[PDB]
Write a protein that binds this ligand. Structure first.
Ligand code: GTP
Ligand code: MG
Lengths: 48, 428
């Protein structure tokens, strides 16, 4: 008589394989608004 | 520094601990031999050339299911002292496991838990997994919690049991093992979660469509509860819920620490990519009164606190709407001394596919652990069975022979009876 060869693979042996790592490369590139150039052009030079 | 020590006692504890320790190991990516080809620190040490070793203590008195661990594929990942065995089993006999054959393996277990806790820069909690209804899970496990409470105090002892199911039990003497193990689960346990087997059968046969599930498939969904419960321990998210956060928002009074589980994005291929699984859909199915993992229907109970742990690409405002629509539903009722009754956690790491498994790719998940007065029926169900069997003293000659008097039975029914009494006085 033959031996029924043991096929069997547990939960811990089956149901996860090493996943590919998540592809993350994205910073928050913020274009700076340039400082709005200032003429609240003062009193002395403004009127006299 | 975040570090949870798992202690798996009993044959069932070894098997559910198997399916757990692969959402711990190679979800972190480590190979079967123990090499990644520091998020692993939640469950693993590190021994030089990339060897991370599980922070587990395997306990059994029969050396046949732990010997499968020593001979399986994963024999070189476990250290060959973390798989502690015995010479002879406990045989559904609470008094053998606690008084006679327990006091030769407990001294080895406390050594390995010592060497695995002095390798700790701050231990979050002992996640001990057992099976109430057997001999070494109800016996040795009860003695383990009593010894761990005296020595290792003030840090949590989250216990997920395998409480005997109402009809299906595959034993006859399990009421004696359940009622007399209630003492450890009521005093020497910080968080207890009832988790039977029929409800996992029902989830597998209704959502997951596997009409013939085996214990290996039951260990699947138990493991997915554990990974989502410690998800914020290891991975970032919008809100984190560690094991100290968990017990402080779900335990109203110190004696009441019993909860229910549900992890219901349970989908499988044909029922997976057809259904849009949004945050509202998975939250409604989590609160649904058939996916509770205890046969513990809460439609006749009062909710007390909930611990919805969203996991994946979940947006916090979608969590906010999902909580709101549960509150407006009338059959989901809450006790009156709790206007805020949810502890929402969000993980960023998505749940993991299973090759050869039962689930599939899902981008989001929920795992809510909820305390309710509905959990008073899982103990009153077994009050009927203990009362019938102890009437004419069946099976008592076993339990009395090796070292407990018959008054242990009466005081444990008294401990059970004072137990359900505290639920209806809290609910009313
Ligand atoms: N989740 C799960 N439960 C199991 C498994 N095997 C048995 N059980 C449950 O365990 C209960 C019987 O208790 P056991 O776990 O076999 O008892 P034990 O912890 O091995 O202790 P002993 O009886 O001394 O061998 C049954 O009612 C089953 O519902 C399993 O592989 N997975
Ligand atoms: Mg056993």
């Amino acid at each position: 008589p033959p031996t029924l060869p043991f096929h069997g693979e547990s939960a811990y042996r089956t149901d996860y394989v090493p996943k590919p790592l998540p592809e993350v490369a994205k910073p928050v590139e913020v274009k700076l608004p340039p400082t709005l150039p200032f003429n609240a052009q003062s009193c002395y030079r403004s009127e006299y | 520094m975040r570090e949870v020590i798992s202690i798996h006692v009993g044959q069932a504890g070894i098997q559910i601990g198997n399916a757990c320790w692969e959402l711990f190991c190679l979800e972190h990516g480590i190979q079967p031999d123990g090499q990644m080809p520091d998020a692993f620190n939640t469950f693993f040490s590190e021994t030089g050339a990339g060897k991370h070793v599980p922070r587990c203590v395997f306990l059994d008195l029969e050396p046949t299911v732990v010997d499968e661990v020593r001979t399986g594929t994963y024999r070189h990942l476990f250290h060959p002292e973390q798989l502690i065995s015995g010479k002879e089993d406990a045989a559904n006999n609470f008094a053998r496991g606690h008084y006679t054959i327990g006091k030769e393996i407990v001294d080895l277990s406390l050594d390995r838990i010592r060497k695995l806790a002095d390798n700790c820069t701050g231990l979050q909690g002992f996640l001990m997994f057992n099976a109430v209804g057997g001999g070494t899970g109800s016996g040795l496990g009860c003695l383990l919690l009593e010894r761990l409470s005296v020595d290792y105090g003030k840090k949590s002892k989250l216990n997920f049991c395998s409480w005997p199911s109402p009809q299906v039990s595959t034993a006859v003497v399990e009421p004696y093992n359940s009622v007399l193990s209630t003492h450890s689960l009521l005093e020497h346990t910080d968080v207890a979660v009832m988790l039977d087997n029929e409800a996992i059968y029902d989830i597998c046969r209704r959502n997951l469509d596997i009409e013939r599930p085996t214990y290996t498939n039951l260990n699947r969904l138990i493991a997915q509860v554990i990974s989502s419960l410690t998800a914020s321990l290891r991975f970032d998210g919008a809100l984190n819920v560690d094991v100290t956060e968990f017990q402080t928002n779900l335990v109203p009074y110190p004696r009441i620490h019993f909860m229910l589980s549900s992890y219901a994005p349970i989908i499988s291929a044909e029922k997976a990519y057809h259904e849009q699984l949004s945050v509202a859909e998975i939250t409604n199915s989590a609160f649904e009164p058939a996916s509770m993992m205890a046969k513990c229907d809460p439609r006749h109970g009062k909710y007390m606190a909930c611990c919805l742990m969203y996991r994946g690409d979940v947006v916090p405002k979608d969590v906010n709407a999902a909580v709101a629509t549960i509150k407006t539903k009338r059959t989901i009722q809450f006790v009156d001394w709790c206007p805020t009754g949810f502890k929402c956690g969000i993980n960023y790491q998505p749940p993991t596919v299973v090759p050869g498994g039962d689930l599939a790719k899902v981008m989001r998940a929920v795992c809510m652990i909820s305390n309710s007065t509905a959990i008073a029926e899982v103990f009153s169900r077994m009050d009927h069975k203990f009362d019938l069997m102890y009437a004419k003293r069946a099976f008592v000659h076993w339990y009395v022979g090796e070292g407990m008097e018959e008054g242990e039975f009466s005081e444990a029914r008294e401990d059970l009876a004072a137990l359900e009494k505290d639920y209806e006085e809290v609910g009313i």
